Ligand binder design. Structure first.
Ligand SMILES: [Zn+2]
Ligand SMILES: [Zn+2]
Ligand SMILES: [Zn+2]
Ligand SMILES: [Zn+2]
Ligand SMILES: [Zn+2]
Ligand SMILES: [Zn+2]
Ligand SMILES: [Zn+2]
Lengths: 406, 405, 405, 138
């Protein structure tokens, strides 16, 4: 059967305007009509959206759904079945804030994706990375400065795996794709949440990265890559990685190179604000909160650099633990620097391109998938109607069906 | 001693004509004379072949002799001695359909080869690949969508899983030690495997080049399973010699293939069979989802190959009880290119693929006595071959008579 | 439907007489009537058995169906598929010799047993031991006088090497999981193995006891290979049910055997064959050295067994091409004990060994229809059974007729 | 009764959260396994001491584990101040298990009164599970 959101103000994003009193007609899981032509079907299932903004459901391009606490070391070592349980409230909450798709950046597997798709569990559609690839001592390696023992099997609460070497990574990519990853995540730089690696230095040989990219391309996907500095970014892009995560410390040299190659960026500014306030407080090791001071500085600044060089920007949050609540705040941070049109584009049209679903998600058009948010107010003028923690979103539709009434 | 097929109409394939009332003289395992002489018969076994076509034994370039059921996964996991037993009917039937030689595309080994050569077992001469090479999550990896891995070779297993330049190098060396005649690899997604979409490529160019090299070092070649023009082109550029299936070529890939001197072995019959009895004969539901797409361009590709001038071999690639439909591939090819070409694919071109140029696939002096005796003329009615064995009443293999029907 | 063997002379073994012009009526797989009535046949397959002996199909309690060549060491190393193939003739020949059931003493598995039961393969019903258990350097260890071992089961290996209580415990649990019907061990040195003198005992008592327990836990028994009285006595004290060979008993051990209710399965015919064609058929020269001694006391042992009152089942144990001599064991045994006994060994005593008392080895109502039709009377001339084949013209198996000769 | 492998072998490094049972043989093997399970915080120990219904290869009449193994398990459980529960159908399978020192018998559908008497005497409990058989009937 069939559903109609009637008399809504449909956000069109490539033009940047509301289209008032347009109806949107859902059949099955797809959008069949956007129009103001009075619709004649009594057989439908209808929902009055008068004076309310109806837009595509949001896509978040960097989450760790399984990061149920801020210490990723201790997150990895929690018992499997508990790791799973604790991710359910995280997922349910992301959906209520209007996120209907998320790209998990290591942690979530094909099983979790299936659980939402068969409706066993409430949450956004997941684009799983499986596990982030990391070299030894890398941003994925949570072993303290000892040492070097250990590790047999995959803990379901582990964000990453350690693999080194050209054949090693090649095999790990094939393994990850067989297990059902949609894209491949690697650490190409030092980070913040790992014990041993200062943020300034690079990770993985160019041979390794390039082998990784190839195996991903052979499986008709791409590599996303965690990198801070212009140095670490440039080489990753030269090796052919498609999206760059964080990227807080670009120079316009790297940005220009990124635009040239057609590489995306997914800044995750919100996480650094959260780790600023509640860093050592929520149980993340004291020398990881030492590293967070520096990256948030250039964070806001980098946005402008990316805009200037014309490098596409996707929405990301990358929040850990109870700081998961601050997810929507990333809209306001981005709106304050680039327009709030751009802020909304990052979570929709740009994001859907990132996840290769151009025309399938992130757009209210005929033939697209019925992932809709119904919004009380107009985001194009007040960004707060989206960036206020689930406050002003009263309907969420996912693949045709209604999943949140608020 | 010595044998004469007298008064047959000998099919000559390079000219494309029957030669009526030509006697053919077999001494030992070799053809000694082909003539329309009244022939000097003292102690010969005369077999009277008046008004019947005598042609070379057919060579199928892509079989899985051990694929005794359509789920290749469950095929792998059946007990060794059962896997072996169940292939015996399969081999027997192929021969009685007139196939005197098969190139096996992963599964059969040197021991099976020997079983038929010593006459312990009835069926075609085998040119065994040993085991198909496949990368992890590749077309020969049959694990479902967190995987422990095995270390002993099941005799029902079509493939083995090897990754890396060194890994594949060792694997080739091993396969040839065990007595492979050529090397099979999966260079693309397929249909009969769980996790790989058909559109994507398998193995790095590094891995393939190493494999080709280790092949060439043993004076043999690589056969490569591959669908799309992209997967094909890169395999050819690495130097693989035959390309299996090849359903989704563009003409840029076909041209390249022509340029390099690379054959194709399409296997169109297997998609029609998988169309009718796919989910019915125990092949997983999401594999029969993947069979819809490849049969479309299937017939169309043959024209592309013909146009760019790429030599085409005969291949069935049928699994399980669908093995019966083997000869049907003659029809499917004859409908698109002439039935000359259809017969050429299973004789002259096929023998070239297996490097038995002048040894098999031609009725000539000095060649091996692999003959089929045919009730009717295939050059006008392709059905005399393509009817599951109906109209073949004699099969000769290395001189001796093996089928009387 | 339904079948009648009419007018035969039905051998009754517990009374030791032919019953002339008795009809036997088969429905399905079972014997429904034995009588000298004019019988009421509407839709019965009448097979006319006038003046010919009809007796139960023979049971051989010690074969190796997979021993396709006399050097067991090289039999183990032959490729899998080839090991399986070569057993097919062996199974066929046995059945045609009247043997409708065999207990395989190491080699055959559950798959082979299934292949005959589903009718995929012609042969006797098999009662597979799986793989014999052997201690290291034991009668099943075929390594020559350095050894790292070997983590994969070759389908032509008679045995496996396992030591220690938990090792053997696990091995039995494995074999029974893979579907053995009973468990075979090597409790002494032998002939066909490189390193063990025949006088030596194998496995401690803790090992044997553990094995016996695991067999009984799965409601079956252990058969044990043993020559000397010493090696026999301790095996029986540990609780083994049947003793294989047993050529070197004293009457002390035989008395013990009788007391415990243990069976013997002598295999005299294998030593006579290994004498003539020993080194000739490719069994290692120092194994033919050991064969001289056991055959001496071979016939003498039969008497000791009869005197002590120990039940004796039929067994060949022939390897390779010496498999032909299978029926000659009847003669050997008839020469020492009456040919009533010889026939009892392969029928009633046998059926008991394999726990099918009442099911096989007797023509009675309710029994399985495993029948042999015999030209002549075995009760007076033992040659009618003991002549390689020759004088058996019908073989019925589970109702159906499988050989017409 | 816990081995779900169909009628080759070598199993499996690590524990799937969906797995009812693990496979362990031998006195030292079971002894360890019990210590591992108690470390991981089990409150009691379950063993399979006879064939069952839900497993592929075991007929129901036959027994599982040697008496040495069961005794080792019962000791390691008692050592951690808990007990063994045991899956077991026939009176033969029950009797042995009880005399090795197991405290509760699961199912126990095929007791004779001799085994019942032995249970009472030893103070062992039974946990019949009749409803599962009616459900698996339908
Ligand atoms: Zn990161
Ligand atoms: Zn991250
Ligand atoms: Zn293929
Ligand atoms: Zn194939
Ligand atoms: Zn023996
Ligand atoms: Zn033996
Ligand atoms: Zn239970």
């Amino acid at each position: 059967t069939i559903t109609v959101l009637q008399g809504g103000n449909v956000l069109d994003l490539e033009r940047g305007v509301l289209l008032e009193h347009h109806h949107v007609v859902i059949d099955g899981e797809r959008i069949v009509e956007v129009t103001d032509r009075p619709v004649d079907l009594p057989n439908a299932q209808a929902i009055d959206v008068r004076g309310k903004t109806v837009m595509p459901g949001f896509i978040d391009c960097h989450v760790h759904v399984l990061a149920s606490n801020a210490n990723l070391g201790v997150n990895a070592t929690q018992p499997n079945i508990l790791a799973a349980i604790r991710s359910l409230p995280i997922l349910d909450a992301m959906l209520s804030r209007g996120f209907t798709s998320v790209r998990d950046a290591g942690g979530a597997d094909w099983s979790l994706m299936q659980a939402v798709e068969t409706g066993l569990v409430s949450g956004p559609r997941i684009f799983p990375s499986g596990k982030a690839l990391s070299q030894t001592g890398g941003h994925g390696d949570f072993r303290p400065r000892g040492l070097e023992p250990c590790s047999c099997c995959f803990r379901t609460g582990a964000i990453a795996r350690v693999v080194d070497g050209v054949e090693g990574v090649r095999l790990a990519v094939r393994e990850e794709i067989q297990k059902g990853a949609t894209q491949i995540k690697i650490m190409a730089s030092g980070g913040v949440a790992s014990p041993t690696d200062p943020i300034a230095n690079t990770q993985y040989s160019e041979d390794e990265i390039r082998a990784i990219v190839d195996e991903a391309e052979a499986a008709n996907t791409y590599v996303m890559a965690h990198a801070y500095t212009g140095r670490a970014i440039a080489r990753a892009v030269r090796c052919g990685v498609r999206t760059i995560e964080h990227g807080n410390l670009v120079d316009e040299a790297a940005a220009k190179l990124m635009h040239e190659h057609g590489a995306f960026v997914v800044p995750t500014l919100v996480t650094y604000d959260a780790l600023a306030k509640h860093g050592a407080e929520f149980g993340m090791p004291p020398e990881s909160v030492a590293k967070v001071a520096s990256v948030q500085q250039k964070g806001r600044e980098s946005l402008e650099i990316y805009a200037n060089a014309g490098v596409k920007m996707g929405f990301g949050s990358d929040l850990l633990g109870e700081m998961h609540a601050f997810q929507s705040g990333e809209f306001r941070i981005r709106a304050e620097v680039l327009g709030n049109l751009e802020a909304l584009r990052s979570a929709t049209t740009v994001a859907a391109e990132i996840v290769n679903m151009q025309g399938q998600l992130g757009v209210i058009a005929v033939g697209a998938i019925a992932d809709l948010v119904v919004l009380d107010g107009n985001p194009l003028e007040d960004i707060g109607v989206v960036a206020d923690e689930g406050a002003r979103v009263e309907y969420v539709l996912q693949r045709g069906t209604l999943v949140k009434r608020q």
